[PDB]
Amino acid sequence: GKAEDKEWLPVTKLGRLVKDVKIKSLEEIYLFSLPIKESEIIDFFLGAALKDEVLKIMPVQKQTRAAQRTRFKAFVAIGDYNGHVGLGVKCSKEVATAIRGAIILAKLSIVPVRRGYWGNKIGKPHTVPCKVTGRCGSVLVHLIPAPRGTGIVSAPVPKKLLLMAGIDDCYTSAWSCTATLGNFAKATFDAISKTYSYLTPDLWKETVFTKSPYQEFTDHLVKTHT
RNA sequence: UACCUGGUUGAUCCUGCCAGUAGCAUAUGCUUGUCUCAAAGAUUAAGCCAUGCAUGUCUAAGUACGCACGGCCGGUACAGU
Ligand SMILES: [Mg+2]
Ligand SMILES: [Mg+2]
Ligand SMILES: [Mg+2]
Ligand SMILES: [Mg+2]
Ligand SMILES: [Mg+2]
Ligand SMILES: [Mg+2]
Ligand SMILES: [Mg+2]
């Protein structure tokens, strides 16, 4: 037998500071709104808990002189059940590679979701902090806080991203052509993504400004991989 | 539990309806071991009705010559039922 796998020779400055243990968590990446362009940055921090799920396989096709040329579109949702979630979609000629290329995008689009309390703050937030809305081409999704223990009152499809994001209680609503899974899923993901981009009176303390990870580790980047 | 799913296209995004889904109450089909509770000729013809019953009543205190019984001897407000 043989061993010593040496995958993930990085190609970006962030891959270097992630593979080298210099960077601690992807919260430090989100604080600086950097773009994550390598799917191994995710598996470094998360990975032992990220569970993926194939939401739908959808055969699309173009008419052609000879034929109808079909290829399949895979919608995959991913995320550990403790505050991170993502959703990718890839169109490929065969199913087995669409479902594999979609996991890469679902991992690259992982965002942090915010959770809050409904009535009073006893510990371990359980629901969304406020009423949020999200759209994707005539699909509107409304998320509303709920008391503890109510579960997720929603359709099957939003109650597969809402669970993965870490929310225990939620009242949901939709008013649209919700039968198209692509727009339904993208609008739910958008509503979840708008949960950290909502100014709330606890977010009024002035910002303490830290060093960027590229400024703090200039000395490393100068010659850590070459 | 503040929820959706299939169907117009070669394929996509919509309007929009048809169909699906859960309860409720009238009928009907198949099937039915135990136990408590209990709706029931309203819908249509406030159409027609054989027969039986459903409203009677007395205390010491309105009228007692039924011998209808009956008393200790008879009626003298007159025995009593
Ligand atoms: Mg439809
Ligand atoms: Mg047409
Ligand atoms: Mg067709
Ligand atoms: Mg119907
Ligand atoms: Mg018995
Ligand atoms: Mg009648
Ligand atoms: Mg008669």
Half-sphere exposure of A178 (CA within 13 A, CB side): 15
d(CA A207, CA A221): 27
Residue A125 Cα, ligand 7 centroid: separation in angstroms? 82
Measuring from the CA of residue A172 to each C1' atom, give the nucleotide at the shortest distance: B2
What sign has the CA pseudo-torsion A60, A64, A69, A73?
A: negative
Q: Which structural technique was applied?
A: cryo-EM
Q: By C-alpha distance, which of A32, A35, A45 is closest to A80? A: A45
Q: Can you read off the two tokens belonging to residue A177?
A: 């052509």
Element (H, E) at A155: none
Residue A124 Cα, ligand 7 centroid: separation in angstroms? 83
Q: Is A213 left (phi over 0), alpha (psi -120 to 50) or beta?
A: alpha
Q: Are strands A111-112 and A132-135 parallel, antiparallel or unpaired?
A: unpaired
Judge contact between A126 and A117, C-beta under 8 A. Answer: yes
CA angle A198, A192, A173 (to 5 degrees): 105
Tell me how far CA of residue A133 lies from CA of A147, A188, A189, A226, in angstroms: 19, 8, 10, 47
d(CA A102, CA A51): 13
The whole-number Å distance from A54's CA to B46's C1' is 70
The whole-number Å distance from A104's CA to B78's C1' is 129
Residues 126-185 of chain A sitting with CB below 7 angstroms of strand B: 137-139, 144, 150-151, 153-158, 171-174, 176-184
Residues 77-136 of chain A sitting with CB below 7 angstroms of strand B: none
Backbone torsions φ then ψ of A149, nearest 5 degrees: 95, 0
